[PDB]
Design a binder for this molecule. Structure first.
Ligand SMILES: [Mg+2]
Ligand SMILES: [Mg+2]
Ligand SMILES: [Mg+2]
Ligand SMILES: [Mg+2]
Ligand SMILES: [Mg+2]
Lengths: 47, 100, 206, 357
RNA sequence: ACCCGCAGAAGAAGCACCGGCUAACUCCGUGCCAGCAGCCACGGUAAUACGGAGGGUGCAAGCGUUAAUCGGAAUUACUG
RNA sequence: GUACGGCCGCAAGGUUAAAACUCAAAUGAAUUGACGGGGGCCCGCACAAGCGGUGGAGCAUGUGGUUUAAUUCGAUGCAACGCGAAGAACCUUACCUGGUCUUGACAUCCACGGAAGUUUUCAGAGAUGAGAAUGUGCCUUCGGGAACCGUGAGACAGGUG
RNA sequence: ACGACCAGGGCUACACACGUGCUACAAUGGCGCAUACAAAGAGAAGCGACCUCGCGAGAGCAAGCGGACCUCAUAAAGUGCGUCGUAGUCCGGAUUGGAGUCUGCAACUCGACUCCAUGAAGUCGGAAUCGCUAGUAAUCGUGGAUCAGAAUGCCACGGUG
RNA sequence: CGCGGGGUGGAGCAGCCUGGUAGCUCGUCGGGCUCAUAACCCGAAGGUCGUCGGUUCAAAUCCGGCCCCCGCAACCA
RNA sequence: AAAAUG
């Protein structure tokens, strides 16, 4: 099962190259309560 | 602190209660200038042999309610925070949120 | 979270002392601990029966403990044998022979602790928390409380974030030192977490 | 204390045993011996050669791990008699043949670190930081420190060669050389992208972060600059220079072309007037081109090797450093370590053997 | 075609869905993985949204699905 | 308002005017905020005016970093850094290198055999493990229970994880 | 067994980087010799006058005080003389060793203190930065709490000011 | 291979002309500033002077061999 | 006069 290498024709280091493409992104939690937190409509919504 | 910790000091306390007079006498003769040298030597080894838990040195006084050794008090016998908690509830006689 | 504990700032002003005994520095700490133990025992025993607080007094090495309760029918019981039994355990805890006195609180909803306990109970048997709080406040108002502030904190309705929720009715002068602020806290051991029920009740101005 | 160590050793052996297939290689050995015991087996030499040695190599594993189970018990029994009767010599003889067993285990352990062309050679590792901007950099430095600690614990010379520090705090890229006995063997299996989960100190709102940093480990190769091309491999041909020069250039075989016979690469020169300068200049050029050919073939082989590794994909994400829940889960390990502070202080002994397996 | 006689439930029920829209919600792996999805994005170790089990809802020898066309679009408005 | 084509243009370009693909918004007004190297007002040892510091040195202490078998853990702009540890010799203490105990170190429920306690002998770093001398409280138609240890089974403990 | 019991090591590492406290660099001083002012505390498994011996910390000896009475404790700066004459000093006391005293099972990693010596850096501190509006800062001492034992910390009391 | 010019702390430049005695800017490291980073302010470290011989009391400095780079030349046919 | 970025 392939991954479409955003980098393409990988010549030198495969690991490093991959780590520098969308597959190993910087992933950020959308936490509640604080900063970058507010949701207009919740997961289940207002009742 | 832990229950284990509490148990430890309880054990130590018990040992102290048991062994004190025996400990005391040895201390006394160690102190004594008018005493035999060999006898003194004998006393010192006795003391060395006799339990470490029996000593008042190993007695790290803890909170008598929770178990915290840090923030101990000879007036109340509790943790500082715990004392404060008690105080505010009115559970301590005398202790006023006071100013001077 | 910030403020003074009102019962501790008023302990020599309007609030009478919960601990009313003299002991030397040599014999203070241990006595205090014994008292605490007795309190704990009382809490364990009379949680199903409605109790608020106890006042401890020991003259001539013979303790009299004053108990503030809502209903004397379950607290004393049908006979004074249960009371005697209770006393025995207190005596055992403390050292010296024990005597007790009971006090029925007039207007049970005027006292905060009982109300808090009730709220906790409600929370435990799964009722709408907000609604319960509102009901409590209403009851207090009916009873003739000049002011009532209730406050619950955290894990309300099994939410992933803590919920701070509070109702305020009448006048609750937390800053007035001559005010009779009756403040108590009961912390609910719910399935979802711990909810801390805080309650101030303003009784009168003296 | 010694008897409990025996049991530990036994346990270690047992765990080793499953992966090396005690129940399958013993069955494999059954079938070889069914054919090779017959005198008519050398009808086919080609297959028999490949099987003959194979069986010999597999006998040194199955039967020896049976001589281990048989061994530990005997030594234990040897120990028991002596201690009970207060005899001393047997105590010493009980330790000395347990001693053999550790060496055997090491050899079997060595056999895992023996598989491969490059193992005992000098070792290099590149810790490249991810896309985090700051978090990634922070992670990378941590990783580096962990590696250093590991090196210290094992007992190796650790030489930081290139160190590009973070824009705020951390490491963007770092190349460290680690020299010594089977230095690459321990570190070959560490190669991969490291998944760090953390509550970040750089986020003002204090968000939780899934961060990555590659730790590409590669061994130091022999230099092999250029093979000295012998005259039997070169094809030297001379001809006339193209252009102007009256009677002189029209009548010179000054221009030269050199062709490498097995390759087909051809280098010409018609620069200088002399044949002999050109011959050596076009050879210098021919040598240069040969290097390129050999450099390019090595690079393409590398490229193809790495495109295999690329097609592993998400498998490069090896070890999940869940610091926000303390426990660390490596993909091949199947075990969690509740002491992150020991893991970070270079105690990856729990992770090397499992990933190598 | 239809009608007369015979035994016995005998041989004829299941798919789609249950976050909100959109009628119907809880538990077990799972954990920004796998997966979901018409749209607003669920999934980051308590998922009423994944996947299963139990409990439903609504259809019904079906039911979804994509497609196609119109509507809702008063999103080409002569009506408007 | 771009491509291509046309028409116009000396040229610059203008004019007419798409499609594919792509996104779930794109905006408009207004509202609460926050922010402004906008404006106005006021205030704080905020500046100014002053008084001494620190930073340079040695010493105490705490952190980090490296290191160590282990350097318990937490605290991290102010609002972490003589902080939690109002007191790390042992203990504390959580940690490491060893030696040890598995209903547990601490509880409660037992079933029973034995009242607790009192005195000592050796080995060991000690945890502890045996041995030898001394012992037997309140009522009891008095089986026994209240106390204190041993034993085995489970409930369950427990954890400064 | 990420559980517990013990023993030691540690948490006091050490090329360093920082923070925070203290003593410093001097003659408003350093020391020697006379002398003045307290406040606030803390105490009966405690404090410990008097007398004696110790350079001395401390011992013996033997009263009193559950303690405005007995004590811990003489407050120290200040004042009154004497010196030294701006030196790395009669500055500063670090460090490194020696000789002793308590405390506790025990100071070796690891307590102070009595003493003898020793005399490192430092001659007011780069960039930068910090506190304080009056009994305030600045500065000198005195307690206490956690303490068998051990504060330059912290809480407080007072002197100059 | 010819003639000429260089190779100097991590980068680029002097200093070599005429012997003694190593500077400049950027970085590097350390502090500071700021919520942080960048800039800026302060402090510090870093050199067998391409390599090897020689002469000279002594060589980066002079001379020669060797290596690397740059330039010019490499012609009439 | 000075304040680039997150
Ligand atoms: Mg619904
Ligand atoms: Mg329409
Ligand atoms: Mg146009
Ligand atoms: Mg300094
Ligand atoms: Mg410094």
């Amino acid at each position: 099962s392939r991954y479409q290498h955003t980098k393409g024709q990988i010549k030198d280091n495969a690991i490093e190259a991959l780590l520098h493409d969308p597959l190993f992104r910087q992933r950020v939690e959308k936490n509640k309560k604080g900063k970058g937190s507010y949701m207009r409509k919740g997961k289940h919504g207002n009742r | 602190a832990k229950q284990s910790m509490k148990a430890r000091e309880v054990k130590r306390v018990a040992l102290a209660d048991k062994y004190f007079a025996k400990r005391a006498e040895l201390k006394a003769i160690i102190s004594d200038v008018n005493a035999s040298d060999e006898d003194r030597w004998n006393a010192v080894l006795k003391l060395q042999t006799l339990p470490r838990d029996s000593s008042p040195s190993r007695q790290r006084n803890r909170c008598r309610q929770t178990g915290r050794p840090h923030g101990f008090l000879r007036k109340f016998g509790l943790s500082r925070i715990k004392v404060r908690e008690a105080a505010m509830r009115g559970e301590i006689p005398g202790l006023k949120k006071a100013s001077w | 979270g910030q403020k003074v504990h009102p019962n501790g700032i008023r302990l020599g002003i309007v609030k009478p002392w919960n601990s009313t005994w003299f002991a030397n520095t040599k014999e203070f700490a241990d006595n205090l601990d014994s008292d605490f133990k007795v309190r704990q025992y009382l809490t364990k025993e009379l949680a199903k029966a409605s109790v608020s607080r106890i006042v401890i007094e020991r003259p001539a090495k013979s303790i009299r403990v004053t108990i503030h309760t809502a209903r004397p029918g379950i607290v004393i019981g049908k006979k004074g044998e249960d009371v005697e039994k209770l006393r025995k355990v207190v005596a055992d805890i403390a050292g010296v022979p024990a005597q007790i006195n009971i006090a029925e609180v007039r207007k049970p909803e005027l006292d905060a602790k009982l109300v808090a306990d009730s709220i906790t109970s409600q929370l435990e048997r799964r009722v709408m928390f907000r609604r319960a709080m509102k009901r409590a406040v209403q009851n207090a108002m009916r009873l003739g409380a000049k002011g009532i502030k209730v406050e619950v904190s955290g894990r309300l309705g099994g939410a992933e974030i803590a919920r701070t929720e509070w109702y305020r009715e009448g006048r609750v002068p937390l800053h007035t030192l001559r005010a009779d602020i009756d403040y108590n806290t009961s912390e609910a051991h719910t399935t979802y977490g711990v909810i801390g029920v805080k309650v101030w009740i303003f009784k009168g101005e003296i | 204390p010694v008897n409990n160590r025996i049991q530990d050793l036994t346990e270690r052996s047992d765990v080793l045993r499953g992966y090396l297939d005690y129940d399958a290689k013993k069955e494999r050995l059954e079938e070889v011996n069914a054919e090779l015991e017959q005198p008519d087996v050398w009808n086919e030499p080609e297959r028999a050669q490949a099987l003959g040695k194979e069986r010999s190599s597999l006998e040194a594993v199955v039967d020896t791990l049976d001589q281990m189970k048989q061994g530990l018990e005997d030594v234990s029994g040897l120990l028991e008699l002596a201690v009970e009767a207060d005899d001393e010599e047997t105590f010493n003889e009980a330790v000395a043949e347990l001693d053999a067993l550790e060496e055997k285990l090491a050899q079997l352990e060595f056999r895992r670190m023996f598989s491969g062309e490059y193992d005992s050679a000098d070792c290099y590792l590149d810790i490249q930081a991810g896309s985090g901007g700051t978090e990634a950099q922070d992670w990378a430095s941590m990783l580096e420190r962990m590696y250093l600690r590991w090196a210290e614990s094992r007992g190796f010379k650790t030489e930081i060669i290139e160190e590009s520090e973070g824009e705020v705090a951390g490491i963007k890229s770092v190349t460290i050389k680690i020299s010594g006995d089977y230095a690459y063997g321990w570190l070959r299996t560490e190669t991969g992208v490291h998944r760090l989960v953390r509550k970040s100190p750089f986020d003002s709102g204090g968000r939780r972060h899934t961060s990555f940093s590659s730790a590409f480990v590669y061994p130091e190769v022999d230099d092999d600059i250029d093979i000295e091309i012998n005259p039997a491999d070169l094809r030297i041909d001379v001809y006339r220079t193209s252009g102007a020069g009256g009677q002189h250039v029209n009548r010179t075989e000054s221009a030269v072309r050199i062709t490498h016979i097995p390759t087909g690469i051809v280098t010409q020169c018609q620069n200088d007037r002399s044949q002999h300068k050109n011959k050596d200049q076009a050879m210098k050029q021919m040598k240069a081109k040969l290097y390129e050919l050999e450099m390019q073939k090595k690079n393409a082989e590398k490229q193809a090797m790495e495109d295999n590794k690329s097609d592993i994909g998400w498998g490069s994400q090896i070890r999940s450093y869940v610091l926000d829940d303390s426990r660390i889960k490596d993909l091949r390990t199947g075990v969690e370590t509740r002491n992150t502070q020991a893991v970070l202080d270079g105690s990856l002994d729990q992770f090397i053997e499992a990933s190598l397996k």
